[PDB]
Design a protein around this ligand. Structure first.
Ligand SMILES: CC(C)c1cccc(C(C)C)c1O
Ligand SMILES: CC(C)c1cccc(C(C)C)c1O
Ligand SMILES: CC(C)c1cccc(C(C)C)c1O
Ligand SMILES: CC(C)c1cccc(C(C)C)c1O
Lengths: 484, 484, 484, 484
């Protein structure tokens, strides 16, 4: 029905279009846009364009493998099975040429998709149409028909024309790039992994085509007596032995492992071998470049923690700190960050208000809810107070607060054992989940006791400056703080 | 005419000189400077120096290819066509040597271009003059004339002198570097692409010269019976077969693919082969280094977004957040940044006032102009207010504001559907282009209703602290805000 | 005893578990957790799992070397020593398969270790159980027994089944990764060094297995007359010559150095050679990628200082500063940073209060304790004051303070000689450990004398704004400052 | 004299010691320290240790080349010239072993150089003494003397002992590293260039030693009939042909180019060839890693500007800005930064007060000195005011200030033409060196005219907030500002 026919050719409401246009009402504006651009236009982000390009990619990967083998290793392509393959492929590649006059273009400025038929047509003619045309039509068969109005020169010149089909590769590169840009904003892709697998496919294809070229240049010269096919005495072999040898010869040149059975002798074999070496050595260097970029993407977190740490070593070196002070700093960094590099202030600033209060409640509510000052309070005050907590780590034997020093912060133990000490009492231990320093909120001057970390304390602190800032916004709580 | 003759030798008012000197009046000071430095001086940034160096680069690329072939593969260069090529080239390379006593130098400190003839002369003598001189004059022809006041020793010793012309390569490297520094501040060049194409040109040239060297060392020894030219029986071949073989042999050594037809036998072939291997393996490692640097420049935006994200995963890992909270944070980052890394505060701080207000009007005027508070206002207040808007994203089911909580911000929907809810009414939906929270500007205390995101809201917020700051500068608006 | 039997299978209080769970009381909760999860469960972080996996890694590294040699180069494995090795190994690899139904899993979200037997079982079946099962059981021996209810086809088909044991490699990769994640949060490992040594082990193993494959494919074809083993006439050699040749042939293909004695002739040797070339060239590119990442980790501090410096050169270039001003800036950066890159404000903000006061006392107490203003003060004021000192460097001939200019800072000499000058006196020199500018704290307006650096002064400064801020917190000191 | 003898062995006052210890009085403390540590001690940073290590590096580079050639390619070393070379070298390497009991050690924590003879002795025994001892003494000659109390077994076993001298390489690596750490804090070295040249030296040496090993293993087996020396029929050749071949064979294996004349045949040649391939392929991958790191250090400024720019493109893409707005932003970035990346606020914060005022006077004094408000003022006010100027760039057609808008900044033209426009007058142009907006300092409310950039203005601005801040510190100027 025409409802499904026009539904297929407009950008459907899905994961990708919602993220590209911003809302279902933005998608439904772009739909209305194409539904009024002209008759039977195709949006680049349509399901029809997806499924067509998926058929094209399966056609192209098949033709670019089979075509140079069929031209090189078989005596003629005028038999029925080869006529059927080449006519069936060429009509599909000609439908694709026609649909490119119907399909809108994504703009480099992300502006409103080009959908006027006169601009979609005019931009294709100024770009890919000539390369897409001469690789779509059966140029070898129309030339052969024009010749019907010696045979072994025509049967050889048509092989060179028959390879104009290899320019389909330009559509393969273009249509792969367009669907990778779409799957990137859909499926959470590592860019270096995607670029590695595209290059491996291209390298295997170049090796395959060089393999055909190694035999094709001898074939077009009628296998002269100084070429590798004559020297290895394999002109009369089956197509599968000839192909396997030619592929082995190409792969040997391109990996720079050797020449095949012997070094070249004829001028054609010299220059085809040197071409293969230069192309293969260039392609291997690009592969090593991609492998290096993939490997650097894979331990970036560890690299970055080591760069951070090595700047801490530079600081201690510049100040000439003693070896036991350096070990104490190193030991603090390992307990405080646990090998992880992140910047908490940047990460929390990038979030929204719902995500920040959800993270803060997960970290801190199980600590602060147990304290009698907060067990009485309204949740919208508690969430505001928990956002002022600062995480601190202390090593064994550190004084967290000293008796007689001025109080400025309270502390809540997440982990580790502390101990409070005074001349008037025993050394009372405090453990994971407890709190201390609380009196500093509601006083001035001296702390009454010393608190010292017995194990590695992990703890949250609240300062008087922040506790007062969070009570300027809650006057109904300040009266209870002065009365409990 | 002398108007065009002196116009050619001074820095013309163009794209490059305007950006280098800062203004047309700065260019016209430098012009007056050269027009009074001495007779017929050449500014380094002149059109004459550009067109001369363009002639030199075409001469050098031609001579450095043709000269070692002519010396190596032809019996003598005393015939008329070779005398014409070598005399015509040497006079052009001698005019270039003379013009370098007339051409000012760019200083490493970017100070006023060196234009005193005594400093331009004295700096050239302390640097490149000796290498430029011995590669400019026909040292082989003056030596041959001095010999006219056995032949097969002189015809061989002159070949070694004739290769002093290869030091022209130093001018090719120098003049390429000078025009790349100029085209960089003209044409928006990726540095790694430029350095890749310079290296490919150098590698092809080194392979070509090694190809000549493979045959030249046998030739100067009169093709001894243990060398590759005698072993392969090609001493009597045409120059094109000998060159092709010698190039194939050099390229085989330098790509480390093999030796040619067989491993070396003579001491000359051993040491020339080992030299070729060391040079070629070094050059291939430098090529792989450049390919790696090019490939890292090409997906830098994706690499940087992945490094940023992997630090967000480290934060969630350190805090041991639940898997559904991690999925909610991951899902927020994908909607909030759409795979793009940038720092908006740094980018807006680097711009000028015209560009910031032009960007802010594009983003926000279509939202805020629809609101009755601002539809009455003067544009110079609206632009000041739009600069205080902050972009925020909310996920489905997030409460943007809760009933009874204290109001501090207003919101404008760019995209997505929100819904306002209360016991006194139905769930009124709000869509792309609407606004809510407006009462918070002109009150204190509780919000009257709950607003919850139904889809992913993309929205702009304005806080009361910023709305008050933007009204301290506009007292004529504060009276209308208290009265409308 | 059952105390040690259950003690072995629960996460022991040690360096790693203390850092993973956070405290001894957190470890003792996880212990109680496993001690009540079911009968005889194994925690992934146990000493039993460590020692078992250490036995497995020694078994796997031995079997994956010995098995493909025994299958390839020995006539049959039905003799007693091979039956003993294969049965003894297979029972150990079957105990390991059983213990994986008893061992808890580390979750990707770091949530509470999976310890319910029904989830530990169900997750193993959905993952590695099928690969671990078919590589644990003696599939070749049960098939051979099933055949007892022509011999040279069965003795060859069982060799292919006997290589199902190579899938043990999946356990080797898995168990190596699990213990590297544990040793990373234990022993301060450079990530690129660890990944280099894992890859070298894998490359040697792949070369060893390709070496067996080079001979195995001929062997299964009964050494046809066109294969390398027949061509090199070594079918009857000892196992050690055959292995050495086959390894040399594999290593030649994989390093792309050559084919062995000659290029391939048969279709099996062609395709096995091409497989070996593609695998080896891929593996070498991954090795070059890891070597590059290791080398970038090793001079990161130097790279980063050079990037920092090159941006200082860009600043001076943009402003077109004179060459002597650039030399003065370069000379300042070398004395001020001594080739070291660090950000002191970030490093001090990441520390705790004990570490900051410990570093500040090491740097500054030996200077400020000698001054009469501070020799009278309480240590808890001195430590607060020392934290406000700012490090400054001056070059020879710089005026640190000028007579008649307004005073705002005091200075303490760490290193270098300064000199104070006036019309009323001689040029009094001041040396390492002295102080000057002191009057500015207790006055207003003009400095009474000029101080100029004679050598490179390294000195600490205290500003009046900070000295006043550190006295708002100490009113008992402000009275002495007004009276001494 | 003893004054020069003790002067040589203590750290001299020079470029390096001044930067390492901080001041001449710090050097003179370390001198006094060594002058009282014990009899005849050597400081690691002495001139004597420099000149001794320079003699050692020339000895080591010579012995490590000559020794394996002399052992491998000459019939015996019992003749007088070889006895003289080996005895003269071994006594020098034994003096070096003795001086290491007299030389202090640099500590990894940069603490006071280890100078107690009992710690200098005890630390050497726990480290390098055993390797330095067995490579210092003539182990082959004392063994030969012990044998005097069949000859062709002893003459061969002594060759293996004679190669214990190759462990001198450990001193070469150690002493190179120590002098590179010293020259780094002396001479402004690119780290990747230094590491490249160390690796090239090591690669050439490994190739040279593998070249000796290729012939030595045949020699110790008495040239068996299946080895390359017998197969190539060169057992009776001169030492220079044998060396050249052996080097070519090693270099062929290590660059993976081929085997030499043919593939290996004997078990010794197989395993020595495979060892050479693995070592050479590893070393080439490390070389490619260093080349890649060097190449990334060389265009770091360009890479970093491109990464910065590509984040500006991501911002414009995220906001979907129009193509002409993107071109206007791109055009602004090119005029505002001129392809240069630097952070001016970080660079100025790292400088001292003398360098900041020296840079500010170079940029801005030639502008602001021409204005009548400042031509009357004291220089110590002008320098304070110039530090508040902010650099701004405007494009053609931008309004810098609009008539009737509120004034907040004044402007000084560095470059470009502006024009002031009003209904009451002609369009007055203003050029490089002029100023405008001046009235805003001494008023409130509306600007009287519009100023629009006609070309690209580069200009400095001063805001009223900063002009008032710079007058709070200068009350004697505020009266003139209210009266002129
Ligand atoms: C062109 C072809 C022979 C090729 C070159 C470079 C690298 C590879 C793979 C092995 C990664 C490859 O297949
Ligand atoms: C010197 C010459 C043979 C050469 C060496 C390295 C790399 C290349 C190209 C193929 C990139 C090259 O042509
Ligand atoms: C597969 C095998 C032959 C191999 C390939 C790549 C690199 C190496 C080592 C020398 C690093 C290696 O042993
Ligand atoms: C060991 C030796 C043959 C070697 C290996 C790797 C690289 C080089 C140079 C050419 C950089 C080299 O000389």
């Amino acid at each position: 029905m025409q409802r499904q026919f026009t539904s297929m050719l407009q950008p459907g409401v899905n994961k990708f279009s919602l993220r590209m246009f911003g809302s279902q009402k933005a998608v439904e504006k772009e739909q209305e846009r194409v539904k009024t651009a002209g008759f039977w236009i195709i949006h680049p982000y349509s399901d029809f364009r997806f499924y067509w390009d998926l058929i094209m990619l399966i056609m192209m990967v098949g033709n670019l493998v089979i075509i140079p083998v069929g031209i090189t290793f078989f005596t003629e392509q005028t038999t029925t099975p080869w006529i059927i393959f080449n006519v069936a492929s060429d009509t599909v590649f000609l439908l694709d040429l026609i649909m490119n006059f119907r399909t809108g273009t994504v703009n480099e400025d992300s502006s409103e998709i080009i959908l006027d038929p006169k601009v979609i047509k005019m931009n294709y003619l100024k770009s890919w149409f000539v390369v897409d045309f001469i690789s779509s039509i059966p140029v070898d068969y129309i030339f052969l028909i024009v010749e019907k109005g010696r045979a072994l020169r025509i049967v050889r010149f048509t092989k060179i024309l028959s390879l104009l089909r290899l320019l389909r590769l330009s559509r393969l590169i273009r249509y792969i790039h367009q669907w990778e840009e779409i799957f990137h904003m859909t499926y959470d892709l590592a860019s270096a992994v995607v670029r590695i697998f595209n290059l491996i496919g291209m390298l295997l294809l170049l090796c395959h085509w060089d393999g055909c070229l190694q035999f094709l240049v001898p074939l077009l010269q009628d296998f002269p007596p100084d070429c590798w096919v004559s020297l290895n005495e394999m002109v009369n072999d089956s197509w599968g032995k000839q192909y396997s040898y030619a592929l082995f010869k190409a792969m040997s040149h391109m990996l720079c492992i050797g020449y095949g059975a012997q070094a070249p002798v004829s001028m054609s074999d010299l220059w085809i071998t040197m071409l293969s070496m230069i192309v293969g050595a260039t392609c291997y260097a690009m592969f090593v470049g991609h492998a290096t970029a993939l490997i650097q993407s894979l331990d970036s977190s560890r690299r970055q923690y080591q760069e951070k740490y090595k700047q801490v070593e530079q600081y201690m070196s510049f100040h000439k700190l003693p070896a036991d002070m350096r070990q104490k700093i190193h030991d603090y960094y390992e307990h405080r960050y646990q090998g992880k590099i992140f910047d908490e202030e940047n990460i929390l600033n990038e979030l929204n208000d719902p995500l920040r209060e959800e993270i803060v409640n997960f970290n801190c509510r199980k600590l602060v809810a147990t304290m009698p000052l907060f067990a009485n309070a309204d949740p919208n005050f508690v969430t505001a107070m928990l956002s002022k907590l600062r995480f601190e780590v202390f090593q064994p034997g550190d004084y967290i607060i000293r008796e007689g020093a001025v109080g400025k912060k309270m502390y809540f133990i997440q982990h580790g054992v502390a101990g409070v000490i005074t001349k008037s009492s025993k050394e009372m231990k405090l453990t994971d989940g407890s709190y201390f320093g609380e009196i500093c909120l509601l006083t001035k001057g001296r702390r009454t006791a010393s608190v010292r970390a017995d194990t590695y304390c992990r703890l949250y602190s609240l300062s008087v400056d922040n506790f007062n800032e969070v009570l300027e916004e809650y006057p109904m709580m300040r009266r209870a703080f002065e009365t409990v």
